[PDB]
RNA sequence: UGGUGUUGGCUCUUGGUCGCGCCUGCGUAGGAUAGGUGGGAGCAGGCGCCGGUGAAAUACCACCCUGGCGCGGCUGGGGGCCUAACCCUCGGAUGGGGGGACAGCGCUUGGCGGGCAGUUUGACUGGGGCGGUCGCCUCCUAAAAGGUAACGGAGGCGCCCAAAGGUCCCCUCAGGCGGGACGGAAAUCCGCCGGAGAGCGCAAGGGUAGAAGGGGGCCUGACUGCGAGGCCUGCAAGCCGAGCAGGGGCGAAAGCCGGGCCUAGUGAACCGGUGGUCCCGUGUGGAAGGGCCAU
RNA sequence: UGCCCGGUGCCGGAAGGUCAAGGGGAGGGGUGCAAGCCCCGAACCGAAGCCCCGGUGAACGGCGGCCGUAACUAUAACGGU
RNA sequence: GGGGGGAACCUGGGGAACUGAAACAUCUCAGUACCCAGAGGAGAGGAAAGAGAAAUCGACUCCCUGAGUAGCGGCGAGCGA
RNA sequence: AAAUG
RNA sequence: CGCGGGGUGGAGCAGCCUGGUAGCUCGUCGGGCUCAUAACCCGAAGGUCGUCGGUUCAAAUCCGGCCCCCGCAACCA
């Protein structure tokens, strides 16, 4: 054991107000590394209703960094914009060969429409069920690749509903300045709330919390 | 059974204050599409190319050969 | 009416706020009356000497105000315009407050 | 809401809550009565048809079921995913609405009836290339194709051999 | 239009608006600029 | 047709709902039973990482599922048996039979419903109907101001651009004859000759290289309070607009900017919706609900 | 007294899909010093009807098109789509 | 005791349409026409579980005002305290 | 299983 | 005289709204299996997309005029 004296730091009955779970979320996490503050919420929809699935990203005021290796697969001087954007890996239908055969040392994967074709054609099943493939909804496709690449470093993260009807997403680091994460949370909610499938009967966010990468998850009022 | 019978409500274009007529600052002097006439002395023109007086005075139509046609307004001296 | 067009009922009701249901809010209304005309009588004008005179009448609450010169005389009222309050500061009455 | 006098085969419209597409249209004005529009339709998903008639007035309600070209990416649950090789959006079509979802291929380009950004019909081409990964080197024998489906083929066609198969009859139409 | 879409601008935490027209697909995915509010003067301005 | 009233005895039996907690999820392969999905390099022993495995990986934490039992409250589904309401009957009965808390009937719910009721089923139009047409832009007709008809001739629109907008600085075209590696007959280059035949997102027209065209740097005046004075005009609308204030952009400055070279890209009121605002707020305070601004 | 049950009708389907009152109250809000009083309100349980699966013609009804081909021609028993 | 009659007037129980909206359905015409029961020289109404903002008034009916106001309203026609 | 000369 | 749809390899049909892709079946020629012919198996060739214009960077496709095509109507007298 060890979580016991760690779990007492949560009022199982109570309802916090973000902030409340902010000062707290820091006393909740304690490890031999900086834990990332996770967030979960049982949204009221049906997976089986193809339309209601939720795929959308959000640029955060605080948190999120170049803690990611993004690959820009394109044609033209797009590369120049990309490389100058911070495209750790660059190269069109020649790099597809890297990934296609073994290679796999990145997180995100931006691309340009023009070379996008071949991508999903020969990379579909690989990074497809991996959610890495470029998708408009999850803005990782296009030509303005500049801002795009430059942004996956500042604070824009995706979040697609799972099959159980829930969605989770890292809102920042554990040793984060108090009001930053708490503020970084509303940013995440206000965007997911802003994405309600038109025919979603009932109340949307049904169960929303504030956890730490390793341990305790204090449920809160997603309107705090 | 035809394929026509259409047109657009006339717009009533052209000079709307001739040379030697007294105006007031504001009077639109000319309504036109291109720039058949161009701004002159105390004669600014608008978005739609509509020349209009800039000061109380008279209107003069200076023809400038291949330089176009002008409409000035020599204020009352 | 007529033509079968739209009268000129195209123009809108900006007259916003013109009717809830219980009705009209019973509140106190004020009657003008410019000092210009109390000048008619010289004594102690009281909202009544006024109604009976030929101005204000039952409208209730009197608010002497406006144009005209004041006069040396006490004026009981329910209100005064900043300006007449002045023109009366030239020596006269100022029985504001009023009412029991 | 388009009327009828203004229909044309190909026009897609919403009738009886369902999706159709006039395939036969003939203005009818006999005797001195009012004109009439007599058409024949086809559901967009099921094949079901139905000839009907309407007066000159009666409006119908045009629909926007344009047919972009999607693309298979990968299976998942009892569904399979495609993509409009155009705007690269992601469509999770339920196995039912994917005509011949089998005999398909995780990477093949097919067609879908986009109705409000959701395919209601996903057809591949009449015949596609597929690598048989089964069959006994033993004539008209069964052969499991790379997509798990099985097909009847001749002899010479042996394991690893890529063939063609009419996606409507799932019949061996020759080799690669 | 659809790919077009209407939209306004909010003074950053508050009221007022401008109401322009973004343009989906093309340069989109959010957008803010500098513009003057009925109250006080000049600031950023986000969509919504 | 559900819920209730009239409507009552006695039992038999099954779920479903969420709250919580404990389980649970078994094809290859992986020293093995992989529910997803987001975190994740760590949490005298160990664990994962890393390597291998597969579509996915593996710890520890999350959320939440599939299905399962456990208590806590909450709701239902039927199976029978009964007799006394209610119904039907019986050589005429405060009684006997049969049905039986069903049906019938009362209030209420959703639905089917030309059996019946009220109505609607446009105008122009070389008669009507069928066809075609109906608002907006351009050209002609249109008779050298404006305006002007026809089921006269001929075409467009219901959008679009975050640069295709401001500003400041730069640049000048289409074609034609040479001349040139891959190179049509114009890919790129060089030389002349070329005032506009190019271009100006889209129809046509007027316009325009002493830019309205092309390129680049900063920017967002696609300002808010205003609006003298006019165009057009039956009304309603539509269009131009100098100057002032606030607060900005560009420029050294002069200045320029309250969208777009210009004429289409549209929709009165009503009724509602969203913000804002603090204006009214039915004895008082406060709400309910309105109002004004915005959309 | 042939053939067609895809469409409509009627008949049959103790499962599913959408389902109205009503039940249920997470949770929210207006007021009160407070007990309170008063309003919204999600999960979920709620008939028939419709969807959905089948049946059905002495139920409403429906019952193809373009090419080619035979010892002269024609024509087409035949074949193609 | 009752029963039937009585020109209007009265109360109560029922209750239209043509019309107007320049169609029409909500709305209007109108709780009118009419039917039925009853009442009587009259009938109804009538001593506050009222009004409504006034330290207020003080059954009821009836006329004049308030008032075409407050309002109501496919915020239309128009109805109207 | 499998037509004809 | 209008009303709508149609002219794509030899035949019969896709493709046309959503301009850059010629898809199908039979047929044809080549080669196998047979003594041979079918069938059957292997492989190949073939389309000014009805024409004449225009729009576009480009058209089977979008736009107009014609030419043939198929079906529908022509009523009150
Ligand atoms: Mg005409
Ligand atoms: Mg005309
Ligand atoms: Mg005209
Ligand atoms: Mg004109
Ligand atoms: Mg009208
Ligand atoms: Mg019994
Ligand atoms: Mg009995
Ligand atoms: Mg009995
Ligand atoms: Mg019995
Ligand atoms: Mg009953
Ligand atoms: Mg009913
Ligand atoms: Mg009916
Ligand atoms: Mg009828
Ligand atoms: Mg009748
Ligand atoms: Mg009537
Ligand atoms: Mg007529
Ligand atoms: Mg005629
Ligand atoms: Mg007609
Ligand atoms: Mg017509
Ligand atoms: Mg008009
Ligand atoms: Mg002329
Ligand atoms: Mg003229
Ligand atoms: Mg040149
Ligand atoms: Mg040359
Ligand atoms: Mg070349
Ligand atoms: Mg050359
Ligand atoms: Mg050239
Ligand atoms: Mg610039
Ligand atoms: Mg003004
Ligand atoms: Mg003026
Ligand atoms: Mg006017
Ligand atoms: Mg414009
Ligand atoms: Mg410009
Ligand atoms: Mg109205
Ligand atoms: Mg309103
Ligand atoms: Mg509101
Ligand atoms: Mg107040
Ligand atoms: Mg009151
Ligand atoms: Mg009150
Ligand atoms: Mg009050
Ligand atoms: Mg209080
Ligand atoms: Mg308000
Ligand atoms: Mg048969
Ligand atoms: Mg049938
Ligand atoms: Mg049937
Ligand atoms: Mg059910
Ligand atoms: Mg059920
Ligand atoms: Mg309820
Ligand atoms: Mg309910
Ligand atoms: Mg309180
Ligand atoms: Mg049911
Ligand atoms: Mg028969
Ligand atoms: Mg039939
Ligand atoms: Mg012959
Ligand atoms: Mg012959
Ligand atoms: Mg012969
Ligand atoms: Mg035959
Ligand atoms: Mg009565
Ligand atoms: Mg009566
Ligand atoms: Mg009526
Ligand atoms: Mg009427
Ligand atoms: Mg009496
Ligand atoms: Mg008397
Ligand atoms: Mg009496
Ligand atoms: Mg009335
Ligand atoms: Mg051969």
Short description:
Chain B: One of its GO terms (molecular function) is structural constituent of ribosome. Chain B: This is Large ribosomal subunit protein bL27. This is part of a larger assembly, with chains A (about 220 residues), B (about 80 residues), C (about 100 residues), D (about 180 residues) and E (about 50 residues). Chain A has about 220 residues and is of the alpha+beta class.
Please characterize this protein's 3D structure:
Chain A: It comes from Thermus thermophilus (strain ATCC 27634 / DSM 579 / HB8). The structure is cut from a larger assembly and holds chains A (224 residues), B (77 residues), C (100 residues), D (176 residues) and E (48 residues). Chain A has helices spanning 4-7, 19-28, 78-83, 96-100, 113-127, 145-151, 179-193; strands at 36-37, 40-42, 58-59, 71-73, 89-90, 109-111, 156-157, 166-168, 172-173, 207-211, 217-220. With 224 residues, chain A is an alpha+beta fold. In chain A, the strands form four sheets. Chain A has a four-stranded antiparallel sheet. In chain A, strand 4, helix 3 and strand 5 form a beta-alpha-beta unit. In chain A, 34% of the residues are buried. Helix content of chain B is 0%, strand content 34%. The termini of chain B are far apart. Chain B is built from no helices and six strands. In chain C, 13% of the residues lie in helices and 0% in strands. Chain C starts with 48 loop residues before the first helix and ends in an 11-residue tail after the last helix. Chain E contains no helices and no strands. Chain E is elongated and about 35 Å long. Chains in contact: A-D, A-E. The interface between A and D is medium-sized, with 21 and 20 residues. Bound molecules: magnesium ion (MG) (66 copies). Chain D binds five RNA strands through strand 3 and strand 8.
Layout: helices, strands, pairs:
The structure is cut from a larger assembly and holds chains A (224 residues), B (77 residues), C (100 residues), D (176 residues) and E (48 residues).
Chain A: H1 4-7, H2 19-28, E1 36-37, E2 40-42, E3 58-59, E4 71-73, H3 78-83, E5 89-90, H4 96-100, E6 109-111, H5 113-127, H6 145-151, E7 156-157, E8 166-168, E9 172-173, H7 179-193, E10 207-211, E11 217-220
Parallel strand pairs in A: 4-5, 4-6
Antiparallel strand pairs in A: 1-9, 2-8, 2-10, 3-7, 10-11
Helix pairs in contact in A: 2-7
Chain B: E1 14-15, E2 28-31, E3 43-45, E4 51-53, E5 57-63, E6 69-75
Antiparallel strand pairs in B: 1-2, 2-4, 3-4, 5-6
Chain D: E1 14-15, E2 18-19, E3 24-28, E4 36-40, E5 52-55, E6 65-66, E7 69-71, E8 75-76, E9 79-83, E10 90-94, E11 109-115, E12 119-123, E13 128-131, E14 141-144, E15 150-153, E16 162-166, E17 171-175
Antiparallel strand pairs in D: 1-2, 3-4, 4-5, 6-11, 7-11, 8-9, 9-10, 11-12, 13-16, 14-15, 16-17
One magnesium ion (MG) binds at residues 7, 10 of chain B.
Chain D binds 5 RNA strands through residues 5, 7-12, 16-17, 24-35, 38, 43, 46-52, 55-57, 66-69, 74-76, 86, 114, 125-127, 154-156, 166, 174-175.
Q: Compute the number of helices of chain A.
A: 7
Counted by DSSP, the helix tally of chain E is: 0
Percent of sequence in beta strands of chain E: under 5%
Distance between the ends of chain A: 33 Å
How are helices and strands ordered from N to C of chain A?
HHEEEEHEHEHHEEEHEE
Say what oligomer this is: part of a larger assembly
- List how many beta strands of chain E DSSP finds: 0
What level of helicity do the residues of chain A show? 25-40%
Bound molecules: magnesium ion
State the strand order across the main sheet of chain A.
8-2-10-11
Radius of gyration of chain E: 11 Å
- The shape of chain A is globular
* First-to-last CA distance of chain E: 17 Å
Organism (chain C): Thermus thermophilus (strain ATCC 27634 / DSM 579 / HB8)
GO molecular function (chain C): rRNA binding; structural constituent of ribosome
Subunit structure (chain C): Part of the 50S ribosomal subunit.
Family (chain C): Belongs to the universal ribosomal protein uL15 family.
């Amino acid at each position: 054991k060890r979580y016991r004296a760690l779990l007492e730091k949560v009022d199982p009955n109570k309802v916090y107000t973000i902030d409340e779970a902010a000062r707290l979320v820091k006393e909740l996490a304690t490890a031999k590394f900086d834990e990332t503050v996770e967030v979960h919420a049982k949204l009221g929809i049906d997976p089986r209703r193809s339309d209601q699935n939720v795929r959308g990203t959000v640029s955060l005021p605080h948190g999120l960094g170049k803690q990611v290796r993004v690959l820009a697969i394109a044609k033209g001087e797009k590369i120049k914009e990309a490389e100058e954007a911070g495209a750790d890996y660059v190269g069109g239908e020649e790099i597809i060969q890297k990934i296609l055969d073994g290679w796999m040392d990145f997180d995100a994967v931006v691309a340009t429409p023009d070379v996008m074709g071949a991508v999903g054609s020969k990379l579909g099943r690989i990074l497809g069920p991996r959610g890495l493939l470029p998708n408009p909804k999850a803005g990782t496709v296009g030509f303005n690749i500049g801002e795009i690449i430059r942004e996956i470093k500042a604070g824009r993260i995706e979040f697609r509903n799972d099959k159980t009807g829930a969605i989770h997403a890292p809102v920042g680091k554990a040793s984060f300045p108090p009001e930053k994460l708490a503020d970084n949370i509303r940013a995440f909610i206000r965007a997911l709330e802003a994405h309600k499938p038109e025919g979603a009967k009932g109340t949307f966010l049904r169960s929303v919390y504030v956890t730490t990468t390793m341990g305790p998850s204090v449920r809160i009022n997603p309107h705090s | 059974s035809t394929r026509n019978g259409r047109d657009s409500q006339a717009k009533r274009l052209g000079v709307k204050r001739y040379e030697g007529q007294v105006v007031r600052a504001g009077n639109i002097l000319v309504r036109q599409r291109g720039t058949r006439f161009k701004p002159g002395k105390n004669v600014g023109m608008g978005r739609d190319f509509t020349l209009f007086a800039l000061v109380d005075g008279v209107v003069e139509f200076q023809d400038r050969g291949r330089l176009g046609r002008y409409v000035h307004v020599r204020p009352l001296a | 009416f007529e033509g079968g067009r739209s009268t000129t009922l195209m123009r809108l009701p900006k007259r916003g706020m013109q009717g809830q249901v219980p009705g009209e809010i019973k509140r106190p209304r004020y009657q003008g009356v410019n000092l210009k005309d109390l000048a008619r009588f010289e004594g102690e004008v009281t909202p009544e000497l006024l109604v009976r005179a030929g101005l204000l009448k039952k409208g209730y609450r009197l608010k002497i105000l406006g144009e005209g010169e004041a006069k040396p005389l006490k004026v009981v009222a329910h209100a005064f315009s900043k300006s007449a309050l002045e023109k009366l500061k030239a020596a006269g009455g100022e029985p504001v407050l009023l009412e029991a | 809401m388009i009327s009828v006098t203004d229909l044309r085969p190909g026009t897609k419209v919403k009738m009886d809550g369902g999706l159709w597409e006039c395939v036969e249209y003939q203005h009818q004005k006999l005797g001195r009565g009012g004109a009439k529009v007599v058409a024949k339709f086809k559901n967009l998903e099921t094949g079901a048809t139905v000839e009907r008639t309407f007066n000159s007035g009666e409006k119908l309600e045009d629909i926007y079921v344009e047919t972009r070209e999607l693309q298979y990416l990968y299976p998942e649950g009892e569904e399979m995913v495609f993509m409009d090789l155009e705007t690269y959006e992601q469509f999770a079509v339920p196995r039912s609405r994917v005509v011949g979802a089998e005999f398909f291929k995780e990477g093949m380009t097919a067609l879908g009836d986009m109705y409000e950004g959701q395919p209601i019909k996903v057809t591949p081409p009449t015949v596609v290339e597929l690598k048989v990964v089964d069959t006994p080197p033993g004539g008209s024998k069964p052969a499991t194709l790379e997509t798990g489906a099985v097909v009847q083929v001749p002899l010479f066609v042996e394991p690893g051999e890529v063939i063609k198969v009419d996606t409507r009859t799932g019949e061996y139409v020759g080799r690669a | 239009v659809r790919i077009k879409l209407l939209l306004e601008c909010t003074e950053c935490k508050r009221r007022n608006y401008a109401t322009e027209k973004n343009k989906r697909n093309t340069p989109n995915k959010l957008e803010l600029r500098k513009y003057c509010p009925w109250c006080r003067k000049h600031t950023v301005h986000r969509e919504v």
